[PDB]
Structures are given as C-alpha cells and as structure tokens.
Amino acid sequence: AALRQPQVAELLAEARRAFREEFGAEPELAVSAPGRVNLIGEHTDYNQGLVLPMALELMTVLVGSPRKDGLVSLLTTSEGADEPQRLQFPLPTAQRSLEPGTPRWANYVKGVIQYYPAAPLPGFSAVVVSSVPLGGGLSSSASLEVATYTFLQQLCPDSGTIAARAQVCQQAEHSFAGMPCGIMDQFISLMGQKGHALLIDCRSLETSLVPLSDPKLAVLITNSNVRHSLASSEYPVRRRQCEEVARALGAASLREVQLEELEAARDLVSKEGFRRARHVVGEIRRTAQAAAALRRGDYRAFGRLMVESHRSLRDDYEVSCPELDQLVEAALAVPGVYGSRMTGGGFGGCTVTLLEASAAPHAMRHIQEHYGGTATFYLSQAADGAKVLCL
Numbered sequence: 001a002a003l004r005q006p007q008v009a010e011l012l013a014e015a016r017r018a019f020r021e022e023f024g025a026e027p028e029l030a031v032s033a034p035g036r037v038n039l040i041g042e043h044t045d046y047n048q049g050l051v052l053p054m055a056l057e058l059m060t061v062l063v064g065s066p067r068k069d070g071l072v073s074l075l076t077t078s079e080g081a082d083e084p085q086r087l088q089f090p091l092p093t094a095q096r097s098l099e100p101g102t103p104r105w106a107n108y109v110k111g112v113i114q115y116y117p118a119a120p121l122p123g124f125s126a127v128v129v130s131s132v133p134l135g136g137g138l139s140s141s142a143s144l145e146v147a148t149y150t151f152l153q154q155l156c157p158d159s160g161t162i163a164a165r166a167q168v169c170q171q172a173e174h175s176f177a178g179m180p181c182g183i184m185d186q187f188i189s190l191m192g193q194k195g196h197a198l199l200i201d202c203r204s205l206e207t208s209l210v211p212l213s214d215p216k217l218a219v220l221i222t223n224s225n226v227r228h229s230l231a232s233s234e235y236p237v238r239r240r241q242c243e244e245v246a247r248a249l250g251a252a253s254l255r256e257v258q259l260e261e262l263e264a265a266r267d268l269v270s271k272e273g274f275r276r277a278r279h280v281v282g283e284i285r286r287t288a289q290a291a292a293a294l295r296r297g298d299y300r301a302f303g304r305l306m307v308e309s310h311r312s313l314r315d316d317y318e319v320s321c322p323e324l325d326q327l328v329e330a331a332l333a334v335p336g337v338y339g340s341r342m343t344g345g346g347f348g349g350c351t352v353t354l355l356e357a358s359a360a361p362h363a364m365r366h367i368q369e370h371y372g373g374t375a376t377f378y379l380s381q382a383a384d385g386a387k388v389l390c391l
C-alpha cells in the first residue's frame with residue numbers, strides 16, 4: 001500500500017553503518033529529533049497565537065563523534081538531499097562566520113552551529129539520516145535543526161531554556177534557509193512526548209502536554225506529494241500582511257485582537273488584510289476550543305473546528321491548493337472521520353485527518369483511488385521529542 005512505516009531501529013542502524021564506513025570508526029553518540037503534524041492552529045504561531053502540534057515517529061538522526069581539529073565533517077544519506085551529500089567546514093570564529101550556500105541541506109546544520117549559545121564547541125564528524133519526507137510539510141528542516149542542536153548539547157552543554165533552543169533553531173531557519181518561520185515546529189521537535197499533543201502559547205511560551213492516548217482515535221497524515229512555488233514566496237507575504245493589521249489597530253500582535261474588535265475596526269484596514277486577520281484571530285479561538293475539546297474527549301467539536309480550520313485556510317488565508325482541498329473532501333466524506341484539514345504552511349504537503357481508528361483502512365483504499373495525485377500515508381502515534389543515546 002501507500003502506508004510508510006517508521007522503521008526507527010533501521011534508521012539508526014543505517015546511520016551507524018554509514019558513519020563507520022565513512023569515517024573509519026564507530027560513532028560515539030546518537031541523537032534524534034522528530035518531524036511534526038499540527039493538529040490545529042495554523043498560521044497563528046507568528047501572530048503570538050496558540051498551536052496544537054504533535055511529534056511524529058518520522059525523525060532525523062545524527063550519529064557522530066567530536067574532533068580535535070576544529071572542523072565539521074558531514075555526510076547525509078537522505079535520498080532527496082541536494083548534491084553534494086558531503087560538506088566540511090571549519091567551526092565559525094569571531095574572525096570568520098559560516099555563510100549559507102551549497103548544498104542547501106547543510107545550511108540547517110551550519111545555521112544552528114553559527115548561533116549555538118555555549119562555548120567551547122569542538123569540531124565533529126556526523127552522519128545525518130531522516131525519515132521525514134524532505135520538504136513534504138512535516139517539518140523536516142526543524143527536525144534537522146533540533147537534532148543538530150541536541151548533538152551540540154552533547155559536545156558542549158548549554159545552560160539554557162527550551163525557548164532559547166527553539167529560538168536558535170528558528171534563527172538558523174530565518175538566516176540560513178531564508179524562511180522566516182514562527183516557533184511552532186522547533187518547539188514541538190524539542191518538547192514532544194509520546195502519547196501527547198503539545199498546546200503552545202506563542203505569546204507566553206507556556207506549554208501544556210495534553211494526553212492523546214485513546215486507542216479508538218487515530219491521526220492519519222496524507223502526503224499530497226506536491227509543493228507549489230507559492231509555498232516559499234507567499235508565506236512571508238501572509239506574515240507581512242498580519243503585521244500591517246496589528247499596526248493599524250495599535251495591537252502588539254493579532255493575539256491581542258478579539259474577533260468582535262476586528263469586525264468593528266474594519267474601515268481602518270484593507271479588505272484582504274481583514275480576511276487574513278479574520279482567519280488568524282478566529283483560528284486562535286478555535287485552537288483554545290479544540291484543546292478544551294481534546295481534554296473532554298469531544299472529538300466532534302475538535303473535528304468541526306478542524307474542518308472549520310481548513311475552510312478558513314482555504315477561503316480567508318488562501319494557503320490551500322486543489323490537491324489539499326481534494327484530499328480533505330475525500331477524507332471528510334468518510335463516516336468516522338471527525339475532521340480533516342491541511343497541516344503546516346500549505347500550498348502542498350500533507351493533510352491531517354482525525355478519525356475513529358477502525359475507519360483508517362477504509363481511508364487508505366479510498367484516498368488512493370480518489371486522489372488525482374500520488375498519496376503517501378502515515379498512521380502516526382504521538383511521539384517523543386529530541387532524544388540522546390550514548391553509543
């Protein structure tokens with residue numbers, strides 16, 4: 001079928017074998033950091049909103065060893081990574097900073113090294129592997145940033161907070177990959193816990209670990225296997241718009257703006273800005289309600305909010321695409337599906353469907369038969385965040 005299994009043990013084994021072959025000795029440590037699915041709370045993180053992601057068993061693993069020579073030597077075995085699959089560079093100094101370039105995959109590692117807060121950081125040799133589909137909407141880059149960060153902590157413990165670590169990975173995304181993301185993806189990669197979703201307040205940086213351990217419930221992720229151009233170009237546009245609405249209203253962020261306020265101050269903002277802000281302010285409220293619904297086990301309300309989230313993303317935020325809309329429509333027509341919506345940034349990538357577990361195999365036959373493109377499926381347990389295994 002189209003169901004990709006996690007193969008976690010195999011990923012680690014692959015990394016270890018490649019390291020020994022590449023560097024001529026066994027690696028001294030392993031780390032991992034997962035990708036993520038956002039259950040609800042889309043395009044809210046950079047608006048100081050609420051998000052409700054969970055970590056996946058899809059993950060990036062670094063296996064490696066410190067060096068004595070102050071240089072960094074990398075190999076990736078990820079099919080999908082751009083050429084070359086190897087890069088070496090000296091550690092940044094006060095004299096010489098790292099710079100983004102070729103290959104792109106290495107920019108994530110370089111960025112985290114560049115902004116790593118603690119000293120002295122030694123050089124190191126590492127292999128990077130991942131089961132997160134690269135650029136497929138499940139935060140492959142955050143997983144790589146966080147796995148890198150986790151590895152650096154083993155080389156040179158930081159004395160820091162989870163938020164500070166997320167901010168470093170976020171800065172690497174902004175500065176080295178030119179993607180001005182919010183904090184969500186890094187936060188969940190760090191903080192995920194098996195059998196939990198994570199409610200993140202992106203204003204206060206308070207987090208709640210919300211149990212998500214009912215075996216009658218399942219989360220089916222569907223990869224559209226498309227990424228439209230607009231993905232890259234439009235994300236900063238939406239973010240730039242939101243900022244303009246806050247400015248016009250004298251609000252520090254949209255989070256401080258209530259829906260009742262928005263309808264009443266509309267003359268002060270543009271028509272399209274109003275629609276973007278209506279999505280955002282609206283989505284923050286839905287996410288709060290969705291978290292509360294999850295706690296009560298009220299899936300119908302959660303799912304209604306989720307379908308509601310898709311419609312808002314499609315019509316008000318305009319970050320869906322025909323492929324996503326179709327995957328949702330297909331899912332939403334199946335009995336026992338509570339909700340389905342695009343997840344992540346949009347313009348391609350994955351949908352997330354919350355549904356009765358027993359209905360999942362009905363979905364996989366039907367989605368494959370009734371989706372225009374090539375669907376890939378993950379049936380995902382809520383997973384752990386960043387982890388270390390000493391080798």
Ligand SMILES: O=C1CCCC2=C1C1(CCCCC1)N=C(Nc1nc3ccccc3o1)N2
Binds near residue numbers: 080082103129130134
């Ligand atoms: O081109 C894009 C579009 C923007 C999003 C995005 C990419 C590329 C960047 C460089 C290689 C091609 C795909 N990669 C990631 N993430 C990522 N690359 C990884 C390599 C090894 C392990 C984990 C990894 O995660 N994200």
Ligand SMILES: OC[C@H]1O[C@@H](O)[C@H](O)[C@@H](O)[C@H]1O
Binds near residue numbers: 041044046184185
């Ligand atoms: O919900 C939209 C999300 O888009 C992500 O892919 C981005 O990395 C996050 O920061 C968040 O803004």
